[PDB]
Amino acid sequence: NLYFQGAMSIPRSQTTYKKKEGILTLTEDRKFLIWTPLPATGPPTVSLALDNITNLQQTPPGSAKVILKFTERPRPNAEPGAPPPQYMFQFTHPTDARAEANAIRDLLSQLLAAA
Ligand SMILES: [Cl-]
Ligand SMILES: [K+]
C-alpha cells in the first residue's frame, strides 16, 4: 500500500545528435528528455516531453554504434501515411557508451510506465 517514486540520479550522457556532440539528460522534474550540444551552456536544442514518447528502441549489443531511438506521438496535422517523429542519440563515451545507454533507457522506461 506504500507509493514509491524512483530515486536513481538523473544521468548526463555524452551523445551525438545529427552529427554534433552533446549531452543527453532529463530536466530536474523528469518530464522532458533534453539534448544540448557542447559546450552545454546554451539551451537544449531537443526537448521531448515524456507524455509524447511512444517508443524506445536501441541498437543491439555488438553493433557498430550504441544508439537509442525515441519515437514520438504524431504531430497534429501530419499526413496519415507519414512516419512519426523519431530522434536518435548515439552514445560516444569510449568505455561506457552502452552502460550509459542502459542507464537512460532503464530510467526512461521506469518513468514511462509510471505515467
Ligand atoms: Cl554494445
Ligand atoms: K554520465
Automatic annotation (TrEMBL):
It is found in: Nucleus. Belongs to the TFB1 family. This is RNA polymerase II transcription factor B 73 kDa subunit-like protein. It comes from Chaetomium thermophilum (strain DSM 1495 / CBS 144.50 / IMI 039719) (Thermochaetoides thermophila). The chain holds residues 1 to 108 of 677 of the full protein.
